[PDB]
Amino acid sequence: GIFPTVEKLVEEMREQLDEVDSHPRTSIFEKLPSKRDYPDYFKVIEKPMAIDIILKNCKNGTYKTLEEVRQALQTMFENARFYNEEGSWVYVDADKLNEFTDEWFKEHS
């Protein structure tokens, strides 16, 4: 269905490397923090989101269209910019990776 498209998208997202240390800008977005170790995070963020969740939701049918997958990414980036301070490496990776997704989705379906 739409999994191979999102699969190719995520594969290309993980190919967005940092200019200095060459670390992927998807690093901190791969997984959600443990609720036991970061209880404050989940008290605020109404809709936590990570890459693995988006991938799971494309396989099981929770996300059927690309607008839902794009909307999910937007939420992931909004959560990161809301919880992290401006200028931090996480905030920057959120912006720059968001810049890439915005271009990609306009540049494809």
Scan for tokens 């190719």, then name that residue.
Answer: 8
Scan for tokens 């594969």, then name that residue.
Answer: 11
Residues present in the chain in total: 109
**5 burial class (0-12, 13-18, 19+ CB within 10 angstroms)?**
middle
Domain count, the chain: 1
Resolution of the coordinates, Å = 2.7
Residue 100 to residues 6, 39, 80: CA-CA distances in angstroms? Answer: 14, 30, 16
48: containing domain: 1-109
Long-range contacts of 82-89 (CB under 8 A, 24+ apart): 82/44, 82/45, 83/41, 83/44, 83/45
- Count the neighbouring beta carbons within 10 Å of the beta carbon of residue 13: 19
Asked whether 56 and 66 are in contact (CB, 8 A), the reply is no
CATH number at residue 77: 1.20.920.10
